[PDB]
Amino acid sequence: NLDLFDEKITHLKAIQQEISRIKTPEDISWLRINLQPMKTALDARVTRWIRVYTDFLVNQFRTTQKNLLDFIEKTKDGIKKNPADHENLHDKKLLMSVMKVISDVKDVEPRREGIITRMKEMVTKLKKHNVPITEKGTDDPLQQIDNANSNFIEIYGRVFKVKADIIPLQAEETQNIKRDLDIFMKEVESFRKEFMQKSMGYENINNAYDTIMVYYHKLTAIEGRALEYNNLEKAFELQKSNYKQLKDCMNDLKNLKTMWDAIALIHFQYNDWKTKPWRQIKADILLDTNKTLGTQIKNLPKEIRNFKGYNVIVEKVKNMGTVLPLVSALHSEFMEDRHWSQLKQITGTVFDHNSLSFYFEDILALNLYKYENTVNEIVDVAQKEAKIEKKLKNIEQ
Amino acid sequence: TTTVTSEDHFMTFYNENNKKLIVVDVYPGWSGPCTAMYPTYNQLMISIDDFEKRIDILLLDQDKLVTYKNDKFHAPKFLFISEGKIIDEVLGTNIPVFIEKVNKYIPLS
């Protein structure tokens, strides 16, 4: 802190005096030793460390005065009435003078202490007469700036009241346009979320990219509204509320983007299942079905919160899981052709138990949820029958 | 997924997949890395592009692009590119079982 800096500087001045005393005269301990050259080196290093604390605001004062001077230059422009444009540019300075005036006054007390603290532990005068002259000069312009700011503020308030009526009429029109844009953005992300790949691919991904572009356009519009509110200033609660409403729409858009990514992952799993049906293989299908069921269950648990209508898509995942389960029952090699045929008659499926490599795709049409039940009955019957058949094999042999 | 052959190739593949994420896989966990890299690349590409989509993988073969992406970031080598810019870098060598856990974590925004 500034107070901590002042204490450290006083301690440093005390340390310099102590170090100068601490070298001492040539000490004789069998062979004469001279620290004369060494003492000068210590003084050089001590001054440099002391200089950094003393010169801390030496550079900063000039920069603050350089920055502070610019604010006074804007004040020197002044001028009442005339062009409306100039008012928009000059009006921001008043909003800046208020914040700077409050924060600057708080910042002023430590700065005054810093110049005074160095004077105490620094015998030498910094910038001679100029540093004291500089403080008096800043005080005269600061007082002049305050009186100028009060006159400027009364003029600013009357013109700004006219500006304020114009700002709300324009604001109502902009707000209606913004609400329409927000509704359109909500509909665009929702349409992508509503669309389900399973099956559909590429177009859904393209829709997500289009939604992101719409969100980017909304963000640019949102940035403009915030800038207009900042230019209007006046500590308006409604302007802050409008920004919050835009943020809520952005959060909904982010949730929609997350939903689109989840749909793409589900589509990839669906594509793998379609490839598995063409590949077929009863041994391969049983291993694939168990792996697919575990992955589908994990995906459903991970999905949470987000936006409404997720359950309608979520249900699909359940259907896919059911389909995976129905397929697993077929993976049993216990069933024979006659056993399969009896099941086939009930099922109505042209494809047999082992008809083709592409048979897995054929199996998908009969719904797993709709048809695991009847598949299961058969899978069981077949497994039951072979226990006997196998018994007969013993008696037989 | 984009297969790359350079840090320059890694970065190109990331920039070319700006809407989603392009992950540059520089080298691998030894052990006959090439054929294994292509095989993992095929399963990750279906999980990356098909299943999660979210992510295309581009198996850097084999340079130091991973290190270059990490240097650019200030943030085996895995350098995630969003609109072609490194945004997430991780290093290490992992087995196929570890990759499956990573797929569940995917896809990051």
Helices (H), chain A: 2-23, 36-54, 56-77, 84-120, 130-194, 203-232, 237-279, 282-302, 310-330, 337-347, 359-365, 368-396
- Three-state secondary-structure class, residue B79: strand
Longest Cα–Cα distance of chain A, Å, equals 125
A chain contacts of residue B50, beta-carbon cutoff 8 Å: 264, 267-268, 271-272
CB contact under 8 A, A261 and B107: yes
Which region holds residue A127: left if phi is over 0, alpha if psi is between -120 and 50, else beta? Answer: left
Name which of A57, A58, A55 is nearest A47 in CA terms: A55
> What is the stated resolution of the deposited model, in angstroms?
4.5
Please list, in sequence order, all residues whose beta carbon lies within 8 angstroms of the beta carbon of residue B97, skipping any fewer than 6 positions away.
none
* Strand order, beta sheet including B85-91: B55-60, B21-26, B77-82, B85-91
Q: How close is the nearest chain B Cα to the Cα of A271, in Å?
A: 7
CB contact under 8 A, B106 and A265: yes
- Neighbouring CB atoms inside 10 A of A267's CB total 24
| Residue A374 φ then ψ, to 5° | -75, -30
Structural contact between residues B40 and B58, judged by C-beta atoms closer than 8 angstroms: no
Q: At how many degrees (to 10) do helices A130-194 and A56-77 cross? A: 80
Rounded CA separation A363/A360 (Å) = 5
A chain contacts of residue B52, beta-carbon cutoff 8 Å: 261, 264-265, 268
DSSP output for A184-243: HHHHHHHHHHH-------SHHHHHHHHHHHHHHHHHHHHHHHHHHHHHH-TT-HHHHHHH
Mutation choice for A interface testing from B1, B50, B97 by most A CBs within 10 A: B50
Q: Is B105 on the interface with A (CB under 8 A)?
A: no
- Three-state secondary-structure class, residue A128: coil
Structural contact between residues A369 and A329, judged by C-beta atoms closer than 8 angstroms: no
DSSP output for A82-111: S-HHHHHHHHHHHHHHHHHHHHHHHHHHHH
Structural contact between residues A342 and A325, judged by C-beta atoms closer than 8 angstroms: no
Name which of A1, A44, A49, A48 is nearest A20 in CA terms: A44
The b-or-e profile of A232-260 (16+ CB within 10 A means b, else e) is: bbeeeeebeebeeebeebeebbebbbbbb
Give me the residue from B104, B106, B109 closest to A298, CB to CB.
B104
Rg, C-alpha atoms of chain B: 12
Structural contact between residues A268 and B50, judged by C-beta atoms closer than 8 angstroms: yes
Residue of A nearest to B51 (CA): A268
Q: How close is the nearest chain B Cα to the Cα of A20, in Å?
A: 47
Q: Is A128 on the interface with B (CB under 8 A)?
A: no
Experimental method: cryo-EM
Q: Is A258 on the interface with B (CB under 8 A)?
A: yes
- Give, as one character, the DSSP assignment of residue B51: I
Structural contact between residues A8 and A120, judged by C-beta atoms closer than 8 angstroms: no
Rounded CA separation A349/A339 (Å) = 14
Structural contact between residues A56 and A114, judged by C-beta atoms closer than 8 angstroms: yes
Structural contact between residues B51 and A265, judged by C-beta atoms closer than 8 angstroms: yes
Which region holds residue A394: left if phi is over 0, alpha if psi is between -120 and 50, else beta? Answer: alpha
DSSP output for A6-25: HHHHHHHHHHHHHHHHHH-S
CB contact under 8 A, A265 and B47: yes
Beta bridge partners of A391: none
Q: Is A198 on the interface with B (CB under 8 A)?
A: no
Rounded CA separation A11/A53 (Å) = 11
Beta bridge partners of A276: none
Rounded CA separation A300/A91 (Å) = 55
Beta bridge partners of B79: B24, B89
